[PDB]
């Protein structure tokens, strides 16, 4: 049960939800919905926020168990397409494909919480895998294309040679929030801003 809350001003009274409130603050929250179907929602949200105000940063919060490669590349291109800077925060985890989206934010603006976990994994075989005739020649070739894109895409955002990314990707390397900055995914790890 996500509770609603009421906010008011001399204009009137507005009932709203968390998440709707975060969107008003230009925060896109990428959670467990990592399906191609949700990739479309993230793209719709990025396009809406750019339309509402092209010069204001969009903050994307990432807490997700990866997802399909093809549709998370769709998000990647929208993120790079949009005029406004996109800053990213890793909460919880950014597994596999989500680690690319984390790295994809504007440099100087990739962030993580201290116990955040970033996992680099090879792209899975999914989505349109309906029965290509020579699956071992075609799906195998498509997988090499997907591995190449993930390695290339991380190299462009982490500063590591794509060959290095491959060696780590092939071994399911898991980074801590601090290791992720030394690896080039995170620019900073957030301090806990407690008043006591």
């Amino acid at each position: 049960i996500l509770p609603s809350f009421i906010e008011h001003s001399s204009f009137g009274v507005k009932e709203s939800n968390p998440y709707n409130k975060l969107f008003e603050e230009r925060i896109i929250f990428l959670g467990v919905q990592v399906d191609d179907a949700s990739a479309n929602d993230i793209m719709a949200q990025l396009l809406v926020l750019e339309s509402l105000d092209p010069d204001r940063d969009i903050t994307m919060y990432i807490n997700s168990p990866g997802g399909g490669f093809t549709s998370l590349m769709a998000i990647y291109d929208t993120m790079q397409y949009v005029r406004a800077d996109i800053q990213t925060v890793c909460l919880g985890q950014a597994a596999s494909a989500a680690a690319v989206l984390l790295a994809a934010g504007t440099p100087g603006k990739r962030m993580a919480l201290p116990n955040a976990r970033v996992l680099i994994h090879q792209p899975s075989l999914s989505g349109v895998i309906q029965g290509q005739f020579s699956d071992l020649e075609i799906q195998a070739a498509e997988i090499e294309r997907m591995r190449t894109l993930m390695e290339t895409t991380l190299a462009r955002h982490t500063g590591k040679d794509a060959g290095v990314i491959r060696k780590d990707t092939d071994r399911d390397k898991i980074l801590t929030a601090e290791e992720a900055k030394d690896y080039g995914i995170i620019d900073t790890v957030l301090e806990y801003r407690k008043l006591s």
């Binding site: 603050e25 903050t59 919060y61 603006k109």
Partner: peptide
């Protein structure tokens, strides 16, 4: 989460 996001 601000600052700086927002």
């Amino acid at each position: 989460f601000t600052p700086x996001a927002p």
